[PDB]
Design an enzyme around this catalytic site. Structure first.
Site, PDB file in Angstrom:
ATOM      1  N   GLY A 109       0.871  -1.265  -0.058  1.00 60.95           N
ATOM      2  CA  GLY A 109       0.003  -0.111  -0.036  1.00 60.95           C
ATOM      3  C   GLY A 109       0.937   1.364  -0.068  1.00 60.95           C
ATOM      4  O   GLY A 109       2.150   1.190  -0.293  1.00 60.95           O
ATOM      5  N   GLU A 110       0.277   2.488   0.299  1.00 60.01           N
ATOM      6  CA  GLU A 110       0.867   3.534   0.348  1.00 60.01           C
ATOM      7  C   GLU A 110       0.504   4.431   1.660  1.00 60.01           C
ATOM      8  O   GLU A 110      -0.503   4.902   1.919  1.00 60.01           O
ATOM      9  CB  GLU A 110       0.428   4.645  -0.643  1.00 60.01           C
ATOM     10  CG  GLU A 110       0.717   3.958  -2.220  1.00 60.01           C
ATOM     11  CD  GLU A 110       0.476   4.924  -3.454  1.00 60.01           C
ATOM     12  OE1 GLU A 110      -0.517   5.117  -3.564  1.00 60.01           O
ATOM     13  OE2 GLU A 110       1.261   4.900  -4.086  1.00 60.01           O
ATOM     14  N   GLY A 111       1.208   4.150   2.809  1.00 63.93           N
ATOM     15  CA  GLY A 111       1.250   4.719   4.050  1.00 63.93           C
ATOM     16  C   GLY A 111       1.177   6.431   4.225  1.00 63.93           C
ATOM     17  O   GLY A 111       1.063   7.000   3.106  1.00 63.93           O
TER      18      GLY A 111
ATOM     19  N   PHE B  17       6.606  -8.794   9.247  1.00 63.01           N
ATOM     20  CA  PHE B  17       5.546  -8.473   8.249  1.00 63.01           C
ATOM     21  C   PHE B  17       4.139  -9.651   8.845  1.00 63.01           C
ATOM     22  O   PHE B  17       4.438 -10.266   9.818  1.00 63.01           O
ATOM     23  CB  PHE B  17       5.739  -9.202   7.007  1.00 63.01           C
ATOM     24  CG  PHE B  17       4.498  -9.248   6.233  1.00 63.01           C
ATOM     25  CD1 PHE B  17       3.933 -10.612   5.890  1.00 63.01           C
ATOM     26  CD2 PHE B  17       4.349  -8.451   5.609  1.00 63.01           C
ATOM     27  CE1 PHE B  17       2.769 -10.806   5.100  1.00 63.01           C
ATOM     28  CE2 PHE B  17       3.367  -8.537   4.506  1.00 63.01           C
ATOM     29  CZ  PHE B  17       2.592  -9.842   4.417  1.00 63.01           C
TER      30      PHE B  17
ATOM     31  N   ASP C 246      -1.131   8.506  16.255  1.00 60.69           N
ATOM     32  CA  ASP C 246      -1.751   8.275  15.188  1.00 60.69           C
ATOM     33  C   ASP C 246      -2.403   6.870  14.918  1.00 60.69           C
ATOM     34  O   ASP C 246      -2.470   6.323  13.822  1.00 60.69           O
ATOM     35  CB  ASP C 246      -1.055   8.609  13.852  1.00 60.69           C
ATOM     36  CG  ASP C 246      -2.076   8.570  12.455  1.00 60.69           C
ATOM     37  OD1 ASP C 246      -3.243   9.119  12.787  1.00 60.69           O
ATOM     38  OD2 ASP C 246      -1.452   8.369  11.505  1.00 60.69           O
TER      39      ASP C 246
ATOM     40  N   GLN D 140      -5.999   0.828  10.535  1.00 60.81           N
ATOM     41  CA  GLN D 140      -5.142   0.085   9.489  1.00 60.81           C
ATOM     42  C   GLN D 140      -3.728   0.105   9.934  1.00 60.81           C
ATOM     43  O   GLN D 140      -2.824  -0.647   9.552  1.00 60.81           O
ATOM     44  CB  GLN D 140      -4.928   1.436   8.264  1.00 60.81           C
ATOM     45  CG  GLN D 140      -4.418   2.708   8.333  1.00 60.81           C
ATOM     46  CD  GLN D 140      -4.036   3.694   7.350  1.00 60.81           C
ATOM     47  OE1 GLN D 140      -4.969   3.911   6.585  1.00 60.81           O
ATOM     48  NE2 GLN D 140      -2.900   4.005   7.160  1.00 60.81           N
TER      49      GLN D 140
ATOM     50  N   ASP E 282       4.085   1.419  13.678  1.00 60.03           N
ATOM     51  CA  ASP E 282       4.344   2.972  13.687  1.00 60.03           C
ATOM     52  C   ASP E 282       4.547   3.495  14.970  1.00 60.03           C
ATOM     53  O   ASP E 282       4.081   5.007  14.969  1.00 60.03           O
ATOM     54  CB  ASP E 282       3.233   3.592  12.569  1.00 60.03           C
ATOM     55  CG  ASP E 282       3.467   3.002  11.232  1.00 60.03           C
ATOM     56  OD1 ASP E 282       2.651   3.293  10.430  1.00 60.03           O
ATOM     57  OD2 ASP E 282       4.370   2.118  10.964  1.00 60.03           O
TER      58      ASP E 282
END
Ligand SMILES: NC(=O)c1cc([N+](=O)[O-])ccc1NCc1cccnc1
Length: 294
Positions: A11-13, A78, A123, A127, A141
């Protein structure tokens, strides 16, 4: 890069693009995040580097930080699915209460650990909560927000989700405390229960007013100092608080009680992760195995 074989675009974090990759050597399968520009602040490098030591069963392990050619690469453990996908997949039947409770309990253990080491997430959202076939859930994160910051979107025209942001952040407080994570987790707990986001704001003010419409417009009685916050305006409409029984039905009183403590307006009254772990809601907690279709 060259030591990894891109297996898929995970994906695109919020920082950059993420790929599932296989270490051509170790054979290890990892998540590789390319961090978004030129020079790369050394302050961030030291910060990020410290997180490699922040290891806990409910925290996605940061395996390596690689700084090269104006690009920063973070290599992470992962996991095959995130909670947002699982919730969507479980939308028809709902996640069973025992699994919701197991996940909340594990997430609180992860927060208690990070918070005890003075590390905040800032945050949290479905997701970045990752799950595996063993019934484990992990926070991804942690500490990146501090080690870096925040622009307007993610990194390339992508709308930042405000649904899980604590009210003190929305009111402009410049100093975040561990309480912001408890707020986000409370919002996620409610979403797992009802199968609908609790406060799906589409703008900063819509986010704040959705919170006010449900929990009541805060005042000096319930939140001492709120009227002096940077973005507080005396002109905010004054909404009455609603009953939790209407907010997360059909959650039982143990659940509603814990949620109410995670959603207290005053960050100082908001329950800590450590204290929440002791709440009667977890008296019968277990660790079920989820049905994951990968
Ligand atoms: N550490 C990870 O495995 C992982 C990392 C990110 N990220 O943004 O850095 C996003 C989803 C992830 N897993 C869940 C996932 C989601 C979709 C397809 N494959 C795996």
């Amino acid at each position: 890069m060259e030591n990894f074989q891109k297996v898929e675009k995970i994906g695109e974090g919020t920082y950059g693009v993420v790929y599932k990759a296989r270490n051509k050597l170790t054979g290890e399968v990892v998540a590789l995040k390319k961090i978004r520009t030129e020079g790369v602040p050394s302050t961030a490098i030291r910060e990020i580097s410290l997180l490699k030591e922040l290891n806990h069963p409910n925290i996605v392990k940061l395996l390596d930080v690689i700084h090269t050619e104006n690009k920063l690469y973070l290599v992470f453990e992962f996991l095959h699915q995130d909670l947002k996908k699982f919730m969507d997949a479980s939308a028809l039947t709902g996640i069973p209460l025992p699994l919701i409770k197991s996940y909340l309990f594990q997430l609180l253990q992860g927060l208690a650990f990070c918070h005890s080491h003075r590390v905040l997430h800032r945050d949290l959202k479905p997701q970045n909560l990752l799950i595996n076939t063993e019934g484990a859930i992990k926070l991804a994160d942690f500490g990146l927000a501090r080690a870096f910051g925040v622009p307007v979107r993610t990194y390339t025209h992508e709308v930042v989700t405000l649904w899980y942001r604590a009210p003190e952040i929305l009111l402009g407080c410049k100093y975040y405390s561990t309480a912001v994570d408890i707020w986000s987790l409370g919002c996620i707990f409610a979403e797992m229960v009802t199968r609908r986001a609790l406060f799906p704001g589409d703008s900063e003010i819509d986010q704040l007013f959705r919170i006010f419409r449900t929990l009541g417009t805060p005042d000096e009685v319930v939140w001492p100092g709120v009227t002096s916050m940077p973005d507080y305006k005396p002109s905010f409409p004054k909404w009455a608080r609603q009953d939790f029984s209407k907010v997360v039905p059909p959650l039982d009183e143990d659940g509603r009680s814990l949620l109410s403590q995670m959603l207290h307006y005053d960050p100082n009254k908001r329950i800590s992760a450590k204290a929440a772990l002791a709440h009667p809601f977890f008296q019968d907690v277990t660790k079920p195995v989820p049905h994951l279709r990968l």
